Amino acid sequence: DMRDLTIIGGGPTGIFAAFQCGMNNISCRIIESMPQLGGQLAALYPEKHIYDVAGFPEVPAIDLVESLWAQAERYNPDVVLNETVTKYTKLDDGTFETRTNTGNVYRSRAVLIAAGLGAFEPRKLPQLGNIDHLTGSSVYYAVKSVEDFKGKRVVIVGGGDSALDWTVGLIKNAASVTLVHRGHEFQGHGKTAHEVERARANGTIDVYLETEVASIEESNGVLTRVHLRSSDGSKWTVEADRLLILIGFKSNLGPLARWDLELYENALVVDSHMKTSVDGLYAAGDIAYYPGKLKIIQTGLSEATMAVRHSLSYIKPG
């Protein structure tokens, strides 16, 4: 089933781009890697208020996503969720085939890369080496079940909302809870960050800022203890059964890095029409680069309008 434009990524840029397709009477689909649309706004800061998007005095990120989506849904674009585009091919006839990780192939007359800053892979502690054999047993990047943390000695890495929340949530579940953050202070300093220090002074938990995991110990295929290190060179070891790492998400082009396209500082280089080196292949948003590019919402919206507009000369040359 041929569409005019395949859009890779369902952040604010891909969404507005899908609206642009409707507005301009071309069919499209959005292929999105996450289980929901909204990109960085829905994932990293859904509840935080945005101030610098035109005509929205003060708007929670996730509401803006909803405003943008409602605007585009009128035109009923195909939305593919839970699929990551890993390859494409331009065919003899100029049309496109884009492939996702589930082996699904998608046909379009042209394509728009609106993939931002990656597909939200959890960031790790690579200083610990390849510890896949511990992963999902004693080392976690998310809490898919509290069972795993129950009556266990657990250290928690991070200083955002996820690391904070779970430090208090596991006090009652776990034998011990220890928070360790690289930063000087905690990020997202609100209601939940106003009462974090309590259990620290109380002695029910341990908190360490300015410290990082230096190494770990294991016995019979399970974590035994965690070595810590502060900025001043202070080093100590702590007994730990579980490691819970919540330090955000990685930022790179993922599979799109190995598409033979001009790059400039982890972004796709783009001309005055938002076109890559390959005709009918466009980029817009955080992922696109041109002299003067700002990586903000306002600017991604403009770029989506310009990509879609020029794409009409490729899709239907009239």
Ligand X SMILES: Cc1cc2nc3c(=O)[nH]c(=O)nc-3n(C[C@H](O)[C@H](O)[C@H](O)COP(=O)(O)OP(=O)(O)OC[C@H]3O[C@@H](n4cnc5c(N)ncnc54)[C@H](O)[C@@H]3O)c2cc1C
Site residues, its own copies (CB under 8 A): 12, 16, 19-20, 23, 45, 48-57, 61, 64, 67-68, 70-71, 74, 188-190, 271-274, 290-292, 294, 296, 298-299, 301-302, 305-306, 309-310
**61 vs 256 by CB, closer to its own copies:** 61
**36 vs 67 by CB, closer to its own copies:** 67
Which whole-number Å values give the CA distances from 41 to 36, 50, 188, 225, 295, in the listed order? 11, 10, 15, 36, 13
**153 vs 160 by CB, closer to its own copies:** 160
**24 vs 40 by CB, closer to ligand X:** 40
- Binding-site residue numbers are 13, 32, 40, 45, 85, 120, 286
| DSSP per residue, 16-64 | HHHHHHHHTT--EEEE-SSSSS-HHHHHT-TTSEE--STT-SSEEHHHH
Contact positions toward ligand X, by CB under 6 A? Answer: 8-14, 31-34, 39-41, 44-45, 50, 52, 84-85, 114-120, 254-256, 285-286, 295-298, 300
- Binding-site residue numbers for FAD are 13, 32, 40, 45, 85, 120, 286
Q: Answer for the pair 56, 32: CB distance below 8 angstroms, yes or no.
A: no
Residue with token string 């003067």: 292
Please report, as a single letter, which amino acid is at residue 206.
D
In the bound complex, what is the minimum distance in angstroms from residue 288's beta carbon to ligand X? 8
**71 binds, options its own copies, ligand X, none, Cβ within 5 to 8 A by partner type:** its own copies
**50 vs 174 by CB, closer to its own copies:** 50
Q: Answer for the pair 261, 276: CB distance below 8 angstroms, yes or no.
A: yes
Q: DSSP character for 271?
A: -
**254 binds, options ligand X, its own copies, none, Cβ within 5 to 8 A by partner type:** ligand X
**64 binds, options ligand X, its own copies, none, Cβ within 5 to 8 A by partner type:** its own copies
Q: Answer for the pair 218, 278: CB distance below 8 angstroms, yes or no.
A: no
- Please name every residue paired with 264 in a beta bridge, in sequence order, or none if there are none: 267
**10 binds, options ligand X, its own copies, none, Cβ within 5 to 8 A by partner type:** ligand X
- Please name every residue paired with 78 in a beta bridge, in sequence order, or none if there are none: 29
Q: Answer for the pair 263, 270: CB distance below 8 angstroms, yes or no.
A: no
**316 binds, options ligand X, its own copies, none, Cβ within 5 to 8 A by partner type:** none
- Please name every residue paired with 112 in a beta bridge, in sequence order, or none if there are none: 7, 282
Q: Which of 45, 38, 31 is nearest to 68 (CA)?
A: 38
In the bound complex, what is the minimum distance in angstroms from residue 109's beta carbon to ligand X? 19
**53 vs 174 by CB, closer to ligand X:** 53
Buried b (16+ CB within 10 A) or exposed e, 79-115: bbeebbbbebeeeeeebbebbbeeeeebebbbbbbbb
Overall size of the chain counted in residues: 318
Residue with token string 């960050």: 193
**67 binds, options its own copies, ligand X, none, Cβ within 5 to 8 A by partner type:** its own copies
